[PDB]
UniProtKB/Swiss-Prot annotation:
The chain holds residues 81 to 384 of 386 of the full protein. This is Methionine aminopeptidase 1. The keyword rRNA processing does not apply. It is found in: Cytoplasm. Keywords: Acetylation, Aminopeptidase, Cytoplasm, Hydrolase, Metal-binding, Protease, Zinc, Zinc-finger. Cotranslationally removes the N-terminal methionine from nascent proteins. The N-terminal methionine is often cleaved when the second residue in the primary sequence is small and uncharged (Met-Ala-, Cys, Gly, Pro, Ser, Thr, or Val). Required for normal progression through the cell cycle. Its EC number is 3.4.11.18. It catalyses: Release of N-terminal amino acids, preferentially methionine, from peptides and arylamides. Zn(2+) 4 binds at D151, H214, E247, E278. Binds 2 divalent metal cations per subunit. Has a high-affinity and a low affinity metal-binding site. The true nature of the physiological cofactor is under debate. The enzyme is active with zinc, cobalt, manganese or divalent iron ions. Has high activity with zinc; zinc cofactor is transferred into the active site region by the ZNG1 zinc chaperone. Its cofactor is Zn(2+); Co(2+); Mn(2+); Fe(2+). Belongs to the peptidase M24A family. Methionine aminopeptidase type 1 subfamily.
Amino acid sequence: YRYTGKLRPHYPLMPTRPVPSYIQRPDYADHPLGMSESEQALKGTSQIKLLSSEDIEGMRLVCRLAREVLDVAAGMIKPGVTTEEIDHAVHLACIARNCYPSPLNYYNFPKSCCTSVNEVICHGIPDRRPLQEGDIVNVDITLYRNGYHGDLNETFFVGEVDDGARKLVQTTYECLMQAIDAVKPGVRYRELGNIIQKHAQANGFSVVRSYCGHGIHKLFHTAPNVPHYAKNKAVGVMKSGHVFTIEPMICEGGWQDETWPDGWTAVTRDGKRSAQFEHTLLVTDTGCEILTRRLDSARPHFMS
Ligand SMILES: O=C(NO)c1ccnc2c1ccn2Cc1ccccc1
Ligand SMILES: [Co+2]
Ligand SMILES: [Co+2]
Ligand SMILES: [Mg+2]
Ligand code: NA
């Protein structure tokens, strides 16, 4: 395998972390290939759940808890910290909040969060590599509580970064917020990729095509499919009571991705950097609520 950049996996991985049996588990947690029977059943349906009041309270709760866990991870980002140590802290933080860390054994993913450095687009596996000054790193969190999943991510700076890193991360965050600002009943899910790609291209960046936003609630990934690029053919119209993610991945060079031999880590084919942000959103009559927002600070972590 020809690595596309400088990054390499740093093995061994710490042995798999257990979740106490007192924590409710999603179906895939105990499936040997990590398959979700509930996702596979709804595979090939395009109908989007209208959440009940009970469902909405359950999503507010788990999305609030997932934000608290991302904020734990954000506190740790500095030179010399391993991504494995971030994952260990995340894993304990979930457990402390009576949540299952959704990524764990999702299609056999080995860890409790994804940590994506520099050319990694998404789904990076926490490992023994110490963060270096100049790195950008994304931490992607998803929790499962009382049957509901809540999903968010942010990209962070590792000490001082270059002007390129600042522009890439700022623009990706702007893409996400412009998409969110368009969300309201009656808007087609395919329109968000037009707004995202228009703002990436105006700043000289490309948009990953292989990974999309998703419906989320009782399932980790379900309808709708929400592409981040222009002129996609996503099916569906936003209705009050829909919940889904927007999670644009923006790249310095081309959009093309490939996967490491580990089967998970997605990287730019050209080895240039990619950044990502993600929120979980509830469509309301007036617009949108950001279920994974910060409650106690106006700005994402990179802004400070
Ligand atoms: O937080 C997440 N997204 O916002 C999240 C998303 C999608 N897939 C995930 C994670 C967790 C683990 N896998 C599963 C996987 C399956 C085949 C290839 C690569 C990864
Ligand atoms: Co996520
Ligand atoms: Co997601
Ligand atoms: Mg090394
Ligand atoms: Na990256």
